[PDB]
Amino acid sequence: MYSVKKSKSGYIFDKPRERIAFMFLKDGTYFMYHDGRILCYSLKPVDVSREELEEFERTGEPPELIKRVKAGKYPENCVVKELPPIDKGLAQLNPNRKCVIIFTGFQDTVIDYVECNGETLAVARLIDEPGKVCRFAGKGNYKVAAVKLKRNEPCLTREEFLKKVEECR
Protein backbone atom coordinates (compact mmCIF):
# COMPACT_ATOMS: atom_id res chain seq x y z
CA MET A 1 0.00 0.00 0.00
CA TYR A 2 1.23 3.41 -1.18
CA SER A 3 0.03 6.62 0.34
CA VAL A 4 -0.83 9.01 -2.51
CA LYS A 5 -0.26 12.78 -2.54
CA LYS A 6 -1.61 14.71 -5.56
CA SER A 7 -0.80 18.35 -6.35
CA LYS A 8 -0.22 20.77 -9.22
CA SER A 9 3.42 19.63 -9.16
CA GLY A 10 2.45 15.99 -9.64
CA TYR A 11 1.72 12.71 -7.89
CA ILE A 12 3.72 11.09 -5.09
CA PHE A 13 3.23 7.46 -4.04
CA ASP A 14 5.14 6.70 -0.82
CA LYS A 15 6.08 3.67 1.27
CA PRO A 16 8.35 3.91 4.35
CA ARG A 17 11.46 3.43 2.21
CA GLU A 18 10.11 3.88 -1.29
CA ARG A 19 8.86 6.72 -3.41
CA ILE A 20 7.39 6.89 -6.91
CA ALA A 21 6.96 10.51 -7.98
CA PHE A 22 5.57 11.91 -11.21
CA MET A 23 6.26 15.58 -11.77
CA PHE A 24 4.39 17.55 -14.42
CA LEU A 25 7.31 19.79 -15.30
CA LYS A 26 8.30 21.65 -18.44
CA ASP A 27 7.19 19.57 -21.41
CA GLY A 28 5.28 16.84 -19.60
CA THR A 29 5.70 14.12 -16.99
CA TYR A 30 9.05 13.12 -15.50
CA PHE A 31 9.39 10.32 -12.99
CA MET A 32 11.53 9.55 -9.99
CA TYR A 33 11.65 6.14 -8.34
CA HIS A 34 13.63 4.99 -5.35
CA ASP A 35 13.58 2.12 -2.89
CA GLY A 36 16.06 1.34 -0.13
CA ARG A 37 18.90 0.59 -2.54
CA ILE A 38 18.44 2.40 -5.88
CA LEU A 39 17.43 5.83 -7.19
CA CYS A 40 16.44 6.32 -10.80
CA TYR A 41 14.85 9.22 -12.62
CA SER A 42 14.13 10.25 -16.19
CA LEU A 43 16.14 12.83 -18.13
CA LYS A 44 13.24 13.30 -20.58
CA PRO A 45 9.45 13.17 -20.11
CA VAL A 46 7.95 9.67 -20.06
CA ASP A 47 4.82 8.18 -21.69
CA VAL A 48 2.67 8.00 -18.54
CA SER A 49 -0.75 9.61 -18.76
CA ARG A 50 -2.84 11.13 -16.01
CA GLU A 51 -5.30 8.27 -16.60
CA GLU A 52 -2.59 5.77 -15.69
CA LEU A 53 -1.85 7.81 -12.55
CA GLU A 54 -5.52 7.74 -11.53
CA GLU A 55 -5.49 3.98 -12.17
CA PHE A 56 -2.33 3.55 -10.07
CA GLU A 57 -4.00 5.51 -7.29
CA ARG A 58 -7.29 3.59 -7.49
CA THR A 59 -5.91 0.04 -7.86
CA GLY A 60 -2.38 0.23 -6.45
CA GLU A 61 -0.79 -1.28 -9.57
CA PRO A 62 2.14 0.91 -10.71
CA PRO A 63 2.43 1.62 -14.45
CA GLU A 64 4.42 -0.81 -16.56
CA LEU A 65 7.29 1.69 -16.81
CA ILE A 66 7.67 1.62 -13.02
CA LYS A 67 7.27 -2.18 -12.89
CA ARG A 68 10.14 -2.55 -15.35
CA VAL A 69 12.20 -0.17 -13.23
CA LYS A 70 11.44 -2.25 -10.11
CA ALA A 71 12.58 -5.31 -12.07
CA GLY A 72 15.90 -3.71 -13.03
CA LYS A 73 14.86 -2.82 -16.60
CA TYR A 74 15.80 0.83 -16.74
CA PRO A 75 14.83 3.00 -19.74
CA GLU A 76 17.58 4.51 -21.86
CA ASN A 77 17.26 8.20 -20.85
CA CYS A 78 17.50 7.67 -17.10
CA VAL A 79 19.90 8.28 -14.23
CA VAL A 80 20.45 5.26 -11.95
CA LYS A 81 22.39 5.64 -8.68
CA GLU A 82 23.13 3.22 -5.88
CA LEU A 83 22.17 4.47 -2.42
CA PRO A 84 24.28 4.11 0.75
CA PRO A 85 23.17 1.71 3.51
CA ILE A 86 20.59 2.84 6.03
CA ASP A 87 22.36 5.15 8.45
CA LYS A 88 24.17 3.06 11.05
CA GLY A 89 23.26 5.41 13.91
CA LEU A 90 19.58 5.26 13.02
CA ALA A 91 19.49 1.62 11.92
CA GLN A 92 18.10 0.21 15.17
CA LEU A 93 15.09 2.59 15.09
CA ASN A 94 13.80 1.27 11.71
CA PRO A 95 13.92 4.64 9.90
CA ASN A 96 12.02 5.73 6.85
CA ARG A 97 14.02 6.72 3.77
CA LYS A 98 13.32 9.32 1.12
CA CYS A 99 15.39 10.90 -1.66
CA VAL A 100 15.22 14.47 -2.93
CA ILE A 101 16.76 15.39 -6.26
CA ILE A 102 17.25 18.18 -8.82
CA PHE A 103 13.49 18.40 -9.57
CA THR A 104 13.03 20.20 -6.24
CA GLY A 105 16.40 22.01 -6.27
CA PHE A 106 18.76 19.52 -4.54
CA GLN A 107 21.89 17.70 -5.52
CA ASP A 108 20.68 14.09 -5.22
CA THR A 109 20.27 13.47 -1.48
CA VAL A 110 19.11 10.48 0.55
CA ILE A 111 17.50 11.07 3.95
CA ASP A 112 16.92 8.46 6.66
CA TYR A 113 14.60 9.69 9.39
CA VAL A 114 12.42 8.76 12.37
CA GLU A 115 9.97 10.64 14.57
CA CYS A 116 11.06 10.38 18.19
CA ASN A 117 9.75 12.26 21.23
CA GLY A 118 7.85 14.69 19.01
CA GLU A 119 11.10 15.47 17.20
CA THR A 120 12.58 14.39 13.88
CA LEU A 121 15.94 12.64 13.77
CA ALA A 122 17.28 12.64 10.22
CA VAL A 123 20.56 11.88 8.48
CA ALA A 124 20.89 13.35 4.98
CA ARG A 125 23.80 12.41 2.72
CA LEU A 126 24.73 13.48 -0.80
CA ILE A 127 24.25 10.39 -2.93
CA ASP A 128 27.23 11.37 -5.16
CA GLU A 129 29.53 12.10 -2.16
CA PRO A 130 28.16 10.12 0.78
CA GLY A 131 30.83 11.50 3.13
CA LYS A 132 28.95 14.84 3.06
CA VAL A 133 26.37 14.41 5.83
CA CYS A 134 23.89 16.42 7.85
CA ARG A 135 22.69 14.88 11.12
CA PHE A 136 19.64 16.75 12.28
CA ALA A 137 17.40 16.75 15.34
CA GLY A 138 14.53 19.22 15.28
CA LYS A 139 10.82 19.98 15.18
CA GLY A 140 10.78 20.46 11.41
CA ASN A 141 10.28 18.07 8.52
CA TYR A 142 12.91 15.51 7.43
CA LYS A 143 13.71 17.72 4.42
CA VAL A 144 15.28 20.24 6.81
CA ALA A 145 18.27 17.90 7.01
CA ALA A 146 18.63 18.02 3.21
CA VAL A 147 18.29 21.81 3.17
CA LYS A 148 20.99 22.25 5.79
CA LEU A 149 23.15 19.90 3.75
CA LYS A 150 22.59 21.93 0.61
CA ARG A 151 23.39 25.14 2.49
CA ASN A 152 26.53 23.66 4.05
CA GLU A 153 25.18 24.54 7.49
CA PRO A 154 26.88 22.75 10.40
CA CYS A 155 24.81 19.87 11.77
CA LEU A 156 25.11 17.53 14.73
CA THR A 157 28.31 15.55 15.13
CA ARG A 158 28.09 11.79 15.25
CA GLU A 159 28.38 11.81 19.08
CA GLU A 160 25.66 14.44 19.61
CA PHE A 161 23.29 12.65 17.22
CA LEU A 162 24.00 9.30 18.86
CA LYS A 163 23.12 10.82 22.22
CA LYS A 164 19.76 11.94 20.78
CA VAL A 165 19.21 8.45 19.31
CA GLU A 166 20.17 6.63 22.53
CA GLU A 167 17.85 8.91 24.56
CA CYS A 168 15.22 7.66 22.18
CA ARG A 169 15.56 3.85 21.87
| Domain assignments of the chain as residue spans, ordered by start | 3-81, 84-166
CA distance 70 to 94: 22
In our burial notation (b when 16+ CB lie closer than 10 A, e otherwise), range 76-100 reads eebeeeebbebbebbeebebbbbbb
Technique behind the model: X-ray
Resolution of the experimental structure, in angstroms? 2.0
C-alpha closest to that of 62 among 81, 46, 78 = 46
